[PDB]
């Protein structure tokens, strides 16, 4: 490890394991149907996903 | 008792004798021990041990299981003259994986844990079914002769044998791998059965003593001849050879002249008794330089296992035929069977191989059990069955308890 600015890991210490938010960035679905208009199977599928 | 000398296995196979501290905890030794083997490898001019990425160094038994890091070497059952292995175990930590939609999740996971049907397996199944088919054909063809011992049975079976044998011939010449050989071997094994009854079915007139002599003979020859050129499936072929040869002698004697079955059966029992004593010797004589020793060892092991098995079949068949609830001093063969069973049970402990020792041990129990059933079905009575049932259940229960307690 190096302190010379470009090394972003300096001063960081491992304490254990757990949950973290991935590097992916989700785009919201266009033309989303209104709630009474949603088909039941595909709804929970997209929701749980 | 303060220290113990042991052999340590290291990288690529070098075994080194070391004198270790008998009471320090094992985790204290692995570091300097690693330095020592590397230094010796360096002085020897070999390449040292090296780590790869993420992992750790551990001290393990020859079986790979690691020793408990905090316990003393004397606390574990490690003694002077034993041997150990230093090993690198890589890091197994990795992210968890989740699939939420249940149908995709069930298919994905279920596809990694089991094996799907494929063409290699399919061929063996076909071979297995045809083998099962022809043995049924000889069976029905073999039953017809009891009512009409004409030429039909021999004539019909002969062509089938030729046809099956002809196929096995082409397969054997073409085989390239053990998978292919398994297909061919199953086919060949099945060819022996029709030829045997085809020959045995040749002597005309009502069936009896004369027909039997031919059958066991060609059977013995065929099994031996197959082994001679094929050199595979030693156990099954050898077992057939033994029971065939002994039966051939008994059948010949009965055909020539025999006052009673008891006379011949007793002779067979004694022949088997002497063979059980000679058994290990027969196995030993029947069987870069290192390769010669490995091949010979398993061949010997194979012949002995079949040999002990063949004798087992003969003595149980003979003993169950010798004892009888009506013939003469009914108690005499019953006590003789007991003494015979004891001999087999005691001698079985002298063998180290599991299948050899187990097959011998089981042979004694089956003899006892068969006699119990024989004296229960014939000369039947409520007390007799009650007594036999109690004996039949406690006998093995006691055997298990003797081993479990």
Short mmCIF file of C-alpha atoms in Angstrom, two decimals:
data_model
loop_
_atom_site.label_atom_id
_atom_site.label_comp_id
_atom_site.label_asym_id
_atom_site.label_seq_id
_atom_site.Cartn_x
_atom_site.Cartn_y
_atom_site.Cartn_z
CA UNK A 1 0.00 0.00 0.00
CA UNK A 2 1.03 3.53 -0.94
CA UNK A 3 -0.08 6.95 0.40
CA UNK A 4 0.84 8.79 -2.83
CA UNK A 5 -2.69 9.93 -3.73
CA UNK A 6 -3.58 7.60 -6.59
CA UNK A 7 -3.81 4.50 -4.33
CA UNK A 8 -7.43 4.73 -3.12
CA UNK A 9 -7.06 1.79 -0.66
CA UNK A 10 -4.71 3.55 1.77
CA UNK A 11 -6.04 3.84 5.33
CA UNK A 12 -8.80 1.27 4.73
CA UNK A 13 -8.96 -1.80 7.02
CA UNK A 14 -10.98 -5.02 6.71
CA UNK A 15 -13.33 -5.66 9.65
CA UNK A 16 -15.42 -8.57 8.33
CA UNK A 17 -17.88 -9.58 5.63
CA UNK A 18 -21.37 -8.42 4.77
CA UNK A 19 -23.74 -6.79 2.30
CA UNK A 20 -22.83 -4.18 -0.30
CA UNK A 21 -24.46 -2.39 -3.23
CA UNK A 22 -23.09 -3.55 -6.64
CA UNK A 23 -21.34 -1.48 -9.31
CA UNK A 24 -24.42 -1.84 -11.58
CA UNK A 25 -26.77 1.11 -12.27
CA UNK A 26 -30.45 0.28 -12.96
CA UNK A 27 -32.50 2.43 -15.35
CA UNK A 28 -36.17 2.90 -14.50
CA UNK A 29 -38.70 1.28 -16.89
CA UNK A 30 -40.26 3.61 -19.45
CA UNK A 31 -44.08 3.86 -19.95
CA UNK A 32 -44.85 1.99 -16.71
CA UNK A 33 -48.55 0.93 -16.62
CA UNK A 34 -50.77 2.28 -13.86
CA UNK A 35 -51.31 0.01 -10.88
CA UNK A 36 -54.74 -1.31 -11.87
CA UNK A 37 -53.31 -1.97 -15.35
CA UNK A 38 -50.43 -4.25 -14.20
CA UNK A 39 -50.55 -7.92 -15.12
CA UNK A 40 -50.05 -10.05 -11.97
CA UNK A 41 -47.28 -12.53 -13.02
CA UNK A 42 -44.85 -10.09 -14.65
CA UNK A 43 -45.36 -7.58 -11.85
CA UNK A 44 -43.95 -9.61 -8.96
CA UNK A 45 -41.29 -10.92 -11.31
CA UNK A 46 -39.96 -7.43 -11.98
CA UNK A 47 -40.52 -6.47 -8.34
CA UNK A 48 -38.63 -9.36 -6.75
CA UNK A 49 -35.89 -9.07 -9.37
CA UNK B 1 9.41 -39.63 25.54
CA UNK B 2 10.30 -35.95 25.12
CA UNK B 3 10.68 -36.27 21.33
CA UNK B 4 9.69 -38.57 18.47
CA UNK B 5 11.23 -39.35 15.08
CA UNK B 6 8.85 -39.28 12.10
CA UNK B 7 8.88 -39.13 8.30
CA UNK B 8 7.58 -35.93 6.71
CA UNK B 9 6.37 -35.79 3.11
CA UNK B 10 7.09 -32.59 1.20
CA UNK B 11 6.75 -31.04 -2.25
CA UNK B 12 6.73 -33.30 -5.31
CA UNK B 13 7.42 -36.38 -3.12
CA UNK B 14 10.61 -36.06 -1.02
CA UNK B 15 10.32 -38.00 2.26
CA UNK B 16 12.54 -36.69 5.09
CA UNK B 17 13.07 -38.18 8.56
CA UNK B 18 12.73 -35.64 11.39
CA UNK B 19 12.84 -35.71 15.22
CA UNK B 20 9.93 -33.59 16.54
CA UNK B 21 9.15 -32.25 20.03
CA UNK B 22 6.58 -34.56 21.58
CA UNK B 23 4.67 -31.95 23.64
CA UNK B 24 4.72 -28.54 21.92
CA UNK B 25 1.49 -27.70 20.04
CA UNK B 26 1.72 -28.53 16.34
CA UNK B 27 1.09 -24.94 15.18
CA UNK B 28 4.42 -23.92 16.76
CA UNK B 29 6.43 -26.28 14.50
CA UNK B 30 5.06 -25.72 10.96
CA UNK B 31 7.00 -22.49 10.34
CA UNK B 32 10.57 -23.68 11.09
CA UNK B 33 9.75 -27.08 9.59
CA UNK B 34 8.95 -25.39 6.24
CA UNK B 35 12.27 -23.52 6.31
CA UNK B 36 14.20 -26.77 6.92
CA UNK B 37 12.67 -28.70 4.00
CA UNK B 38 13.28 -25.74 1.67
CA UNK B 39 16.92 -25.43 2.78
CA UNK B 40 17.50 -29.16 2.22
CA UNK B 41 15.82 -28.97 -1.19
CA UNK B 42 18.06 -25.99 -2.02
CA UNK B 43 21.19 -27.87 -0.90
CA UNK B 44 19.98 -30.92 -2.82
CA UNK B 45 19.64 -28.60 -5.84
CA UNK B 46 15.87 -29.01 -6.20
CA UNK B 47 13.18 -26.35 -6.42
CA UNK B 48 11.74 -25.17 -3.06
CA UNK B 49 8.14 -25.20 -1.93
CA UNK B 50 6.10 -22.15 -2.89
CA UNK B 51 2.71 -20.67 -2.14
CA UNK B 52 0.20 -19.68 -4.82
CA UNK B 53 -2.02 -16.65 -4.29
CA UNK B 54 -4.20 -16.97 -1.20
CA UNK B 55 -3.96 -19.98 1.09
CA UNK B 56 -2.14 -21.44 4.07
CA UNK B 57 0.42 -24.07 5.08
CA UNK B 58 -0.75 -26.97 7.24
CA UNK B 59 0.56 -30.24 8.66
CA UNK B 60 -1.58 -33.25 7.81
CA UNK B 61 -1.65 -37.01 8.04
CA UNK B 62 -0.87 -39.10 4.99
CA UNK B 63 -4.66 -39.14 4.52
CA UNK B 64 -4.70 -35.32 3.99
CA UNK B 65 -6.81 -34.49 7.04
CA UNK B 66 -5.15 -31.64 9.00
CA UNK B 67 -4.08 -32.00 12.64
CA UNK B 68 -5.66 -29.76 15.29
CA UNK B 69 -3.40 -26.68 15.50
CA UNK B 70 -3.71 -26.18 19.30
CA UNK B 71 -3.15 -29.76 20.46
CA UNK B 72 0.16 -31.33 21.44
CA UNK B 73 1.75 -33.98 19.24
CA UNK B 74 1.46 -36.53 22.09
CA UNK B 75 -2.18 -35.62 22.67
CA UNK B 76 -2.96 -37.02 19.21
CA UNK B 77 -2.27 -40.68 18.37
CA UNK B 78 1.04 -39.94 16.63
CA UNK B 79 3.95 -42.22 17.55
CA UNK B 80 7.64 -42.51 16.76
CA UNK B 81 8.06 -44.12 13.34
CA UNK B 82 4.82 -42.74 11.88
CA UNK B 83 4.78 -40.28 8.95
CA UNK B 84 3.22 -36.88 8.22
CA UNK B 85 2.63 -34.51 5.29
CA UNK B 86 3.10 -30.74 4.96
CA UNK B 87 0.53 -29.29 2.58
CA UNK B 88 -0.78 -26.05 1.10
CA UNK B 89 -4.55 -25.47 1.29
CA UNK B 90 -5.91 -22.66 -0.92
CA UNK B 91 -8.42 -20.00 0.15
CA UNK B 92 -12.06 -21.07 -0.47
CA UNK B 93 -13.79 -17.76 0.39
CA UNK B 94 -16.06 -16.50 -2.42
CA UNK B 95 -19.26 -14.49 -2.90
CA UNK B 96 -22.66 -16.04 -2.35
CA UNK B 97 -25.03 -16.42 -5.28
CA UNK B 98 -28.82 -15.93 -5.33
CA UNK B 99 -31.58 -16.64 -7.86
CA UNK B 100 -35.03 -15.56 -6.70
CA UNK B 101 -37.50 -16.63 -9.39
CA UNK B 102 -38.23 -20.17 -8.32
CA UNK B 103 -38.48 -21.92 -11.71
CA UNK B 104 -35.14 -20.69 -13.02
CA UNK B 105 -33.58 -21.28 -9.62
CA UNK B 106 -34.77 -24.90 -9.48
CA UNK B 107 -33.48 -25.77 -12.93
CA UNK B 108 -30.07 -24.13 -12.54
CA UNK B 109 -29.13 -25.70 -9.21
CA UNK B 110 -30.61 -29.09 -9.98
CA UNK B 111 -28.43 -29.26 -13.16
CA UNK B 112 -25.07 -29.09 -11.32
CA UNK B 113 -25.54 -31.78 -8.66
CA UNK B 114 -26.51 -34.79 -10.83
CA UNK B 115 -25.59 -36.58 -14.06
CA UNK B 116 -27.78 -36.60 -17.19
CA UNK B 117 -28.17 -39.58 -19.51
CA UNK B 118 -25.60 -39.62 -22.35
CA UNK B 119 -24.67 -41.93 -25.27
CA UNK B 120 -21.84 -43.74 -23.46
CA UNK B 121 -24.22 -45.03 -20.78
CA UNK B 122 -26.94 -45.82 -23.30
CA UNK B 123 -24.85 -48.49 -25.07
CA UNK B 124 -24.18 -50.44 -21.86
CA UNK B 125 -27.93 -50.55 -21.13
CA UNK B 126 -28.57 -52.15 -24.49
CA UNK B 127 -25.89 -54.77 -23.88
CA UNK B 128 -27.32 -55.50 -20.43
CA UNK B 129 -30.85 -56.09 -21.79
CA UNK B 130 -29.76 -58.49 -24.57
CA UNK B 131 -27.71 -60.47 -22.07
CA UNK B 132 -30.79 -60.72 -19.84
CA UNK B 133 -32.88 -61.74 -22.85
CA UNK B 134 -30.86 -64.75 -24.04
CA UNK B 135 -30.47 -66.17 -20.53
CA UNK B 136 -34.29 -66.25 -20.44
CA UNK B 137 -34.35 -67.94 -23.86
CA UNK B 138 -32.00 -70.72 -22.77
CA UNK B 139 -34.08 -71.05 -19.63
CA UNK B 140 -37.33 -71.79 -21.48
CA UNK B 141 -35.51 -73.89 -24.09
CA UNK B 142 -33.87 -75.77 -21.19
CA UNK B 143 -37.26 -76.48 -19.59
CA UNK B 144 -38.83 -77.98 -22.75
CA UNK B 145 -36.37 -80.93 -22.83
CA UNK B 146 -37.75 -82.32 -19.55
CA UNK B 147 -40.96 -83.12 -21.43
CA UNK B 148 -39.50 -83.75 -24.92
CA UNK B 149 -35.72 -84.30 -25.07
CA UNK B 150 -35.61 -84.21 -28.88
CA UNK B 151 -32.98 -82.47 -31.07
CA UNK B 152 -34.96 -79.19 -31.14
CA UNK B 153 -33.46 -77.83 -27.91
CA UNK B 154 -29.84 -78.41 -28.95
CA UNK B 155 -30.33 -77.39 -32.59
CA UNK B 156 -32.11 -74.12 -31.71
CA UNK B 157 -29.70 -73.05 -28.94
CA UNK B 158 -26.58 -73.81 -30.98
CA UNK B 159 -27.33 -71.19 -33.64
CA UNK B 160 -28.01 -68.49 -30.98
CA UNK B 161 -24.66 -69.20 -29.31
CA UNK B 162 -22.89 -68.94 -32.66
CA UNK B 163 -24.68 -65.69 -33.45
CA UNK B 164 -23.88 -64.08 -30.05
CA UNK B 165 -20.28 -65.34 -30.16
CA UNK B 166 -19.83 -63.99 -33.69
CA UNK B 167 -20.91 -60.51 -32.56
CA UNK B 168 -18.56 -60.59 -29.55
CA UNK B 169 -15.72 -61.52 -31.88
CA UNK B 170 -16.18 -58.40 -34.04
CA UNK B 171 -16.57 -56.18 -30.97
CA UNK B 172 -13.44 -57.50 -29.27
CA UNK B 173 -11.32 -56.85 -32.35
CA UNK B 174 -12.70 -53.30 -32.64
CA UNK B 175 -12.67 -52.18 -28.95
CA UNK B 176 -10.44 -49.19 -28.08
CA UNK B 177 -11.28 -48.22 -24.43
CA UNK B 178 -12.45 -49.87 -21.22
CA UNK B 179 -15.94 -48.55 -21.90
CA UNK B 180 -15.98 -50.48 -25.17
CA UNK B 181 -14.50 -53.52 -23.43
CA UNK B 182 -17.33 -53.52 -20.86
CA UNK B 183 -19.79 -53.80 -23.76
CA UNK B 184 -17.83 -56.69 -25.31
CA UNK B 185 -17.23 -58.51 -22.02
CA UNK B 186 -20.94 -58.53 -21.15
CA UNK B 187 -21.72 -59.93 -24.60
CA UNK B 188 -19.05 -62.67 -24.29
CA UNK B 189 -20.06 -63.61 -20.75
CA UNK B 190 -23.56 -64.17 -22.11
CA UNK B 191 -22.31 -66.45 -24.93
CA UNK B 192 -21.13 -69.19 -22.50
CA UNK B 193 -24.63 -70.00 -21.19
CA UNK B 194 -26.31 -71.11 -24.48
CA UNK B 195 -23.32 -73.23 -25.62
CA UNK B 196 -23.36 -75.05 -22.28
CA UNK B 197 -26.99 -76.22 -22.45
CA UNK B 198 -26.67 -76.86 -26.21
CA UNK B 199 -23.99 -79.51 -25.57
CA UNK B 200 -25.65 -80.87 -22.43
CA UNK B 201 -28.86 -81.30 -24.46
CA UNK B 202 -27.19 -83.61 -27.06
CA UNK B 203 -27.34 -87.05 -25.37
CA UNK B 204 -30.82 -88.39 -26.18
CA UNK B 205 -33.43 -90.08 -24.02
CA UNK B 206 -34.81 -89.02 -20.65
CA UNK B 207 -32.58 -86.60 -18.79
CA UNK B 208 -30.37 -87.66 -15.89
CA UNK B 209 -26.81 -88.54 -14.86
CA UNK B 210 -25.33 -88.87 -18.40
CA UNK B 211 -26.45 -85.45 -19.73
CA UNK B 212 -25.06 -83.54 -16.70
CA UNK B 213 -21.45 -84.72 -17.27
CA UNK B 214 -21.21 -82.96 -20.66
CA UNK B 215 -22.64 -79.64 -19.45
CA UNK B 216 -20.31 -78.91 -16.54
CA UNK B 217 -17.31 -80.01 -18.65
CA UNK B 218 -17.74 -77.71 -21.66
CA UNK B 219 -18.72 -74.99 -19.18
CA UNK B 220 -15.42 -75.40 -17.32
CA UNK B 221 -13.50 -75.45 -20.62
CA UNK B 222 -15.31 -72.41 -22.04
CA UNK B 223 -14.74 -70.35 -18.89
CA UNK B 224 -11.06 -71.32 -18.86
CA UNK B 225 -10.65 -70.71 -22.61
CA UNK B 226 -12.19 -67.23 -22.34
CA UNK B 227 -9.78 -66.33 -19.53
CA UNK B 228 -6.80 -67.64 -21.51
CA UNK B 229 -7.18 -65.18 -24.39
CA UNK B 230 -9.12 -62.32 -22.73
CA UNK B 231 -7.23 -61.86 -19.44
CA UNK B 232 -10.08 -59.85 -17.86
CA UNK B 233 -12.94 -60.48 -15.38
CA UNK B 234 -10.82 -63.07 -13.51
CA UNK B 235 -13.13 -63.48 -10.50
CA UNK B 236 -16.33 -64.44 -12.32
CA UNK B 237 -14.63 -66.84 -14.76
CA UNK B 238 -12.52 -68.52 -12.03
CA UNK B 239 -15.57 -69.18 -9.83
CA UNK B 240 -17.34 -70.93 -12.71
CA UNK B 241 -14.26 -73.10 -13.39
CA UNK B 242 -14.07 -74.46 -9.81
CA UNK B 243 -17.75 -75.43 -9.34
CA UNK B 244 -17.79 -76.89 -12.86
CA UNK B 245 -14.72 -79.13 -12.45
CA UNK B 246 -15.81 -80.55 -9.06
CA UNK B 247 -19.35 -81.23 -10.31
CA UNK B 248 -17.93 -82.92 -13.42
CA UNK B 249 -16.10 -85.47 -11.21
CA UNK B 250 -19.18 -86.11 -9.03
CA UNK B 251 -21.47 -86.44 -12.06
CA UNK B 252 -19.04 -88.89 -13.70
CA UNK B 253 -18.86 -91.00 -10.51
CA UNK B 254 -22.66 -91.05 -10.17
CA UNK B 255 -22.99 -92.02 -13.84
CA UNK B 256 -20.36 -94.78 -13.59
CA UNK B 257 -21.22 -96.17 -10.16
CA UNK B 258 -22.38 -94.70 -6.84
CA UNK B 259 -24.20 -96.38 -3.96
CA UNK B 260 -25.61 -93.12 -2.59
CA UNK B 261 -25.53 -89.35 -2.82
CA UNK B 262 -24.37 -89.15 0.81
CA UNK B 263 -21.19 -90.97 -0.24
CA UNK B 264 -20.35 -88.48 -3.01
CA UNK B 265 -21.45 -85.41 -1.00
CA UNK B 266 -19.17 -86.38 1.89
CA UNK B 267 -16.30 -86.81 -0.58
CA UNK B 268 -16.98 -83.35 -2.00
CA UNK B 269 -17.11 -81.82 1.49
CA UNK B 270 -13.67 -83.30 2.30
CA UNK B 271 -12.26 -82.14 -1.06
CA UNK B 272 -13.43 -78.61 -0.27
CA UNK B 273 -12.00 -78.87 3.25
CA UNK B 274 -8.53 -79.64 1.88
CA UNK B 275 -8.94 -76.94 -0.79
CA UNK B 276 -9.70 -74.33 1.89
CA UNK B 277 -6.32 -75.15 3.45
CA UNK B 278 -4.47 -74.95 0.11
CA UNK B 279 -6.36 -71.84 -1.09
CA UNK B 280 -3.71 -69.15 -0.37
CA UNK B 281 -1.00 -71.26 -1.95
CA UNK B 282 -3.03 -71.79 -5.12
CA UNK B 283 -3.55 -68.05 -5.45
CA UNK B 284 0.16 -67.34 -5.01
CA UNK B 285 1.27 -69.92 -7.61
CA UNK B 286 -1.50 -69.22 -10.13
CA UNK B 287 -0.40 -65.63 -10.59
CA UNK B 288 10.09 -48.69 -13.97
CA UNK B 289 10.63 -52.22 -12.69
CA UNK B 290 7.95 -51.65 -10.00
CA UNK B 291 5.07 -52.29 -12.45
CA UNK B 292 5.64 -56.07 -12.42
CA UNK B 293 4.84 -56.27 -8.69
CA UNK B 294 1.59 -54.25 -8.85
CA UNK B 295 0.04 -56.32 -11.66
CA UNK B 296 0.85 -59.62 -9.93
CA UNK B 297 -0.55 -58.53 -6.54
CA UNK B 298 -4.08 -57.73 -7.76
CA UNK B 299 -4.19 -60.82 -9.99
CA UNK B 300 -3.43 -63.02 -6.99
CA UNK B 301 -5.98 -61.14 -4.87
CA UNK B 302 -8.59 -61.72 -7.60
CA UNK B 303 -8.02 -65.49 -7.97
CA UNK B 304 -8.19 -66.02 -4.20
CA UNK B 305 -11.48 -64.10 -3.83
CA UNK B 306 -13.18 -66.20 -6.51
CA UNK B 307 -11.61 -69.40 -5.16
CA UNK B 308 -12.89 -68.90 -1.61
CA UNK B 309 -16.27 -68.04 -3.15
CA UNK B 310 -16.48 -71.16 -5.31
CA UNK B 311 -15.71 -73.43 -2.34
CA UNK B 312 -18.32 -71.56 -0.27
CA UNK B 313 -21.02 -72.36 -2.85
CA UNK B 314 -20.03 -76.03 -2.88
CA UNK B 315 -19.96 -76.51 0.92
CA UNK B 316 -23.33 -74.81 1.49
CA UNK B 317 -24.93 -76.85 -1.31
CA UNK B 318 -23.26 -80.00 0.00
CA UNK B 319 -23.97 -79.39 3.72
CA UNK B 320 -27.68 -78.62 3.11
CA UNK B 321 -27.89 -81.86 1.10
CA UNK B 322 -26.04 -83.90 3.74
CA UNK B 323 -28.13 -82.92 6.77
CA UNK B 324 -31.67 -84.31 6.78
CA UNK B 325 -34.48 -84.54 9.38
CA UNK B 326 -35.39 -88.17 8.48
CA UNK B 327 -32.18 -89.93 7.37
CA UNK B 328 -30.55 -92.05 10.10
CA UNK B 329 -29.03 -90.43 13.20
CA UNK B 330 -30.61 -87.05 12.41
CA UNK B 331 -28.47 -85.33 15.08
CA UNK B 332 -25.11 -86.54 13.66
CA UNK B 333 -24.98 -84.28 10.55
CA UNK B 334 -26.50 -81.41 12.56
CA UNK B 335 -23.59 -81.38 15.05
CA UNK B 336 -21.07 -81.96 12.21
CA UNK B 337 -22.48 -78.87 10.46
CA UNK B 338 -21.91 -76.95 13.70
CA UNK B 339 -18.24 -77.97 13.90
CA UNK B 340 -17.80 -77.19 10.17
CA UNK B 341 -19.35 -73.72 10.67
CA UNK B 342 -17.00 -73.01 13.58
CA UNK B 343 -13.95 -73.84 11.44
CA UNK B 344 -15.03 -71.42 8.69
CA UNK B 345 -15.89 -68.68 11.23
CA UNK B 346 -12.47 -68.97 12.96
CA UNK B 347 -10.31 -69.30 9.83
CA UNK B 348 -11.97 -66.24 8.25
CA UNK B 349 -10.19 -63.93 10.74
CA UNK B 350 -6.77 -64.72 9.17
CA UNK B 351 -7.60 -62.66 6.04
CA UNK B 352 -6.98 -58.91 5.76
CA UNK B 353 -9.00 -58.22 2.58
CA UNK B 354 -12.53 -57.04 3.38
CA UNK B 355 -14.37 -58.98 0.67
CA UNK B 356 -12.33 -62.13 1.35
CA UNK B 357 -12.90 -62.01 5.12
CA UNK B 358 -16.56 -60.97 4.79
CA UNK B 359 -17.35 -63.62 2.18
CA UNK B 360 -15.85 -66.32 4.41
CA UNK B 361 -17.68 -65.03 7.51
CA UNK B 362 -21.00 -64.83 5.68
CA UNK B 363 -20.53 -68.34 4.31
CA UNK B 364 -20.74 -69.74 7.85
CA UNK B 365 -23.92 -67.79 8.73
CA UNK B 366 -25.72 -68.82 5.52
CA UNK B 367 -24.89 -72.49 6.18
CA UNK B 368 -26.40 -72.25 9.67
CA UNK B 369 -29.44 -70.32 8.42
CA UNK B 370 -30.06 -72.77 5.54
CA UNK B 371 -29.98 -75.76 7.92
CA UNK B 372 -32.42 -74.00 10.26
CA UNK B 373 -34.86 -73.44 7.39
CA UNK B 374 -34.39 -77.02 6.14
CA UNK B 375 -35.29 -78.52 9.55
CA UNK B 376 -38.25 -76.07 9.79
CA UNK B 377 -40.00 -76.66 6.44
CA UNK B 378 -39.65 -80.45 6.59
CA UNK B 379 -40.76 -82.26 9.76
CA UNK B 380 -42.79 -79.11 10.44
CA UNK B 381 -44.48 -78.43 13.78
CA UNK B 382 -45.56 -75.39 15.85
CA UNK B 383 -42.78 -75.90 18.41
CA UNK B 384 -40.22 -76.55 15.67
CA UNK B 385 -40.99 -73.32 13.78
CA UNK B 386 -41.18 -71.39 17.07
CA UNK B 387 -37.77 -72.73 18.12
CA UNK B 388 -36.23 -72.23 14.67
CA UNK B 389 -37.59 -68.67 14.46
CA UNK B 390 -36.09 -67.81 17.88
CA UNK B 391 -32.76 -69.41 16.92
CA UNK B 392 -32.75 -67.79 13.48
CA UNK B 393 -33.32 -64.28 14.92
CA UNK B 394 -31.04 -64.45 18.00
CA UNK B 395 -28.10 -66.01 16.09
CA UNK B 396 -27.28 -62.90 14.00
CA UNK B 397 -28.44 -60.54 16.77
CA UNK B 398 -25.82 -62.12 19.05
CA UNK B 399 -23.22 -61.84 16.29
CA UNK B 400 -23.94 -58.12 15.88
CA UNK B 401 -23.86 -57.56 19.64
CA UNK B 402 -20.53 -59.38 19.92
CA UNK B 403 -19.08 -56.95 17.38
CA UNK B 404 -20.91 -53.82 18.58
CA UNK B 405 -20.26 -54.21 22.33
#
